[PDB]
Design a protein around this ligand. Structure first.
Ligand SMILES: CCCCCCCC/C=C/CCCCCCCC(=O)OC[C@H](O)CO
Ligand SMILES: CCCCCCCC/C=C\CCCCCCCC(=O)OC[C@H](O)CO
Ligand SMILES: CCCCCCCC/C=C\CCCCCCCC(=O)OC[C@H](O)CO
Ligand SMILES: CCCCCCCC/C=C\CCCCCCCC(=O)OC[C@H](O)CO
Ligand SMILES: *C\C=C(C)/C=C/C=C(C)/C=C/C1=C(C)CCCC1(C)C
Length: 231
């Protein structure tokens, strides 16, 4: 409904995830290389899931009211349903690019699950001061992920094919900068201190989400690093 001022950004987000899904879908037709097919499958699913959850927030299904600080506070819980399934897939794109081992993949996906899950608990907590305890644990799990992407993945990438290493380093830098903004927006927005209003908070997440999913995919899927070395 248009009674919520943030609706314009939810509608724009819905449209851009939908167009991004359609573009990757058609671009992925004809790809027969089995390696490339993995990356197209992982990367096309990411905006498709986000499309459905931006639509649920636009129509009002993905919104709940949570009492804290005396007031009833609108909390879009569908963001966490979105991020639970899309953030592991983005990490898989990076780990498959560098041929990460299985133990490291499991550690990354597990820390990511702890990240989003404790962020969800913090979003729905009724005692104000406890919301920030959960924010801190979630941020600690994120810092572990960022550490592994630098001091574990970067070291191996330098020992692989040059195009793999070069594409990895670009996507790593994009991920580190964009993921690090998310905890800041939560802390000063309606889920945390309440300094920035919800309509502006929704704009900022919309720009971060499209850049981290559609922009990330455009860089990856235009690279030759996703094809096997063939003659
Ligand atoms: C790829 C090309 C596209 C480039 C696009 C990049 C733009 C990102 C914008 C961000 C935040 C905008 C923040 C706007 C803040 C307005 C809030 C305000 O000023 O409200 C006044 C208030 O009533 C009294 O303080
Ligand atoms: C206006 C359009 C709105 C947005 C569109 C609606 C999205 C939700 C619907 C469908 C899922 C469609 C398929 C998603 C799975 C794609 C996976 C893929 O492309 O895999 C390629 C691989 O190479 C194969 O082996
Ligand atoms: C490789 C793995 C691929 C993973 C593919 C999975 C994508 C699932 C997508 C979307 C719908 C999300 C639906 C979430 C359901 C929430 C419904 C609910 O619990 O509502 C409670 C209550 O009724 C109201 O507050
Ligand atoms: C690498 C990724 C880093 C992610 C983790 C970085 C955490 C730092 C955040 C916040 C302290 C900001 C102030 C919190 C106190 C809010 C009360 C207040 O002073 O109001 C705000 C003021 O108006 C305007 O700064
Ligand atoms: C879909 C796009 C991406 C990059 C999503 C990123 C989400 C996070 C980095 C979440 C961060 C949080 C932390 C670490 C602190 C509490 C709140 C969050 C769950 C938003």
């Amino acid at each position: 409904a248009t009674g919520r001022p943030e609706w314009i950004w939810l509608a724009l987000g819905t449209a851009l995830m939908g167009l991004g899904t359609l573009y990757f879908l058609v671009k992925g037709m004809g790809v027969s290389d089995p390696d490339a097919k993995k990356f197209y499958a992982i990367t096309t699913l990411v905006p498709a899931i986000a499309f459905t959850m931006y639509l649920s927030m636009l129509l009002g299904y993905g919104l709940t009211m949570v009492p804290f600080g005396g007031e009833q506070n609108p909390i879009y819980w569908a963001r966490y349903a979105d991020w639970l399934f899309t953030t592991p897939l983005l990490l898989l794109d990076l780990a498959l690019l560098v041929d990460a081992d299985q133990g490291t993949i499991l550690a990354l996906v597990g820390a990511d699950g702890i990240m989003i899950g404790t962020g969800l608990v913090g979003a729905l907590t009724k005692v104000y001061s406890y919301r920030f305890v959960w924010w801190a644990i979630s941020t600690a799990a994120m810092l572990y992920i960022l550490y592994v992407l630098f001091f574990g993945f970067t070291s191996k990438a330098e020992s692989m094919r040059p195009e793999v290493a070069s594409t990895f380093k670009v996507l790593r830098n994009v991920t580190v900068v964009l993921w690090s903004a998310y905890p800041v927006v939560w802390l000063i927005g309606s889920e945390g201190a309440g300094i920035v209003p919800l309509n502006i908070e929704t704009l900022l997440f919309m720009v971060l989400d499209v850049s981290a999913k559609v922009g990330f995919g455009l860089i990856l899927l235009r690279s030759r690093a996703i094809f096997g070395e063939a003659e």
